[PDB]
Design a protein around this ligand. Structure first.
Ligand SMILES: [Ca+2]
Ligand SMILES: [Ca+2]
Ligand SMILES: [Ca+2]
Ligand SMILES: [Ca+2]
Length: 389
């Protein structure tokens, strides 16, 4: 019958922009005079499930020169994997939008990118070449990769992380922490272990430095102890437009559009800083304009200063156990149980719906309460609430 979903999906959309969308944690490695980093990637498998890829990373400077040593922060990447319809070689088209929350001078403007990788995965050797450009200023990368040794023995999505964090847009306010540009042009060495759960592991040594106009990324990859018809060598992973981002049912994309339109009250198909701010205000939270722009900048890939529904879907569809799709809907309870008594009342349920921009009769408040209320009491409890997933 009922979609309170739009109300919850509305609150949900606010907690995600606030909590913030960044998936790659960067700690400094004083000792090795560079950076360390750990992160998961959840590759979707055809016929159900996700193939976990545990990432371990250390980058150290090549150059003798000085180098910036950061406080703990996050990088957020959104990826968009494609095929070139004309291209008939094994290839991948990557588009990336990457942001964080002396060598800087080199990344102002549009630098072209060469990428070159040598793999040995259970003695299945292969090479990949990369052409394209990076605009660090807007955090955008374009790249086309080609397997120059025939058919790639591993799925392209598993090579994405291995195939240039010096293109991450570090906002001016944080320019102090951009280790990767600071390292250039001498460059940096980026070493990783990538552990594929219940399967083998990649071992990468890459060096990232300028050769003239172009930022070059050169990679030896060794792939050890892989199950030979497991998910990697056995090619069992959905290509997926995104790395690290999921699908949604017809029922979810509808409710999400409905929630989107509670922010986008003018119907221009765009949420502005003011549009977002009114809704937040409505639910007794008064963010600053500066926070509102930071919040939008998170999902504003095309740098037009507004969230369109596509940008909103991508945020709402972030992976599955980002932390837990539960922890998140438990975090919604707070907003709805305004008195804090441990229950969301018909009164409270009204107050919210009203605030967010739902017109409703008092016979419809009552319907939602009964629709949600397993225990008979005329109140939704935090379990009753998360139950109505
Ligand atoms: Ca609008
Ligand atoms: Ca936009
Ligand atoms: Ca209450
Ligand atoms: Ca109840």
């Amino acid at each position: 019958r009922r979609t309170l979903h739009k109300a919850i999906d509305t609150v949900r959309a606010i907690n995600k922009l606030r909590e913030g969308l960044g998936n790659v944690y960067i700690k400094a490695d004083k000792q090795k005079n560079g950076i360390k980093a750990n992160f998961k990637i959840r590759h979707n498998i055809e016929d159900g499930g996700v193939q976990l890829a545990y990432h371990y990373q250390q980058n150290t400077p090549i150059g003798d020169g000085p180098v910036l040593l950061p406080d703990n922060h996050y990088l957020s990447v959104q990826s968009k994997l494609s095929k070139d319809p004309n291209e008939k070689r094994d290839h991948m088209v990557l588009l990336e939008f990457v942001t964080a929350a002396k060598g800087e001078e080199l990344f102002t403007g549009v630098v072209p990118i060469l990428v070159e990788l040598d793999g040995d995965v259970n003695g299945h050797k292969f090479s990949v070449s990369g052409e394209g450009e990076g605009d660090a200023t807007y955090g955008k990368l374009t790249l086309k990769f080609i397997c120059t040794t025939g058919k790639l023995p591993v799925p392209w999505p598993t090579l994405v992380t291995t195939l240039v964090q010096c293109f991450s847009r570090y906002p001016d306010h944080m320019k102090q922490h951009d280790f990767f540009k600071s390292a250039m042009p001498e460059g940096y060495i980026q070493e990783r272990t990538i552990f594929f759960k219940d399967d083998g592991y990649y071992k990468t040594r890459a060096e990232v430095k300028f050769e003239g106009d172009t930022l070059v990324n050169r990679i030896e990859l060794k792939g050890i102890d892989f199950k030979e018809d497991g998910n990697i060598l056995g090619h069992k992973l959905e290509y997926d437009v995104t790395l690290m981002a999921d699908s949604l049912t017809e029922e979810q994309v509808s409710e999400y559009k409905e929630a989107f339109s509670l922010f986008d009250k003018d119907g221009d198909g765009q949420i502005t800083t003011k549009e977002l701010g009114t809704v937040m205000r409505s639910l007794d939270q008064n963010p600053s304009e500066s926070e509102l722009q930071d919040m939008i900048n998170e999902v504003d890939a095309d740098n037009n200063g507004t969230i369109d529904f596509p940008e909103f879907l991508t945020m709402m569809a972030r992976k599955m156990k980002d932390t837990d799709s539960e922890e998140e809907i438990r975090e919604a309870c707070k907003v709805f149980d305004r008195d804090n008594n441990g229950f969301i009342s018909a009164a409270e349920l009204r107050h919210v719906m009203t605030s967010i921009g739902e017109k409703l009769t008092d016979d419809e408040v009552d319907e939602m309460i009964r629709e949600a209320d397993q225990d008979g009491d005329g109140r939704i409890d935090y379990n009753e609430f998360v139950q109505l997933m």
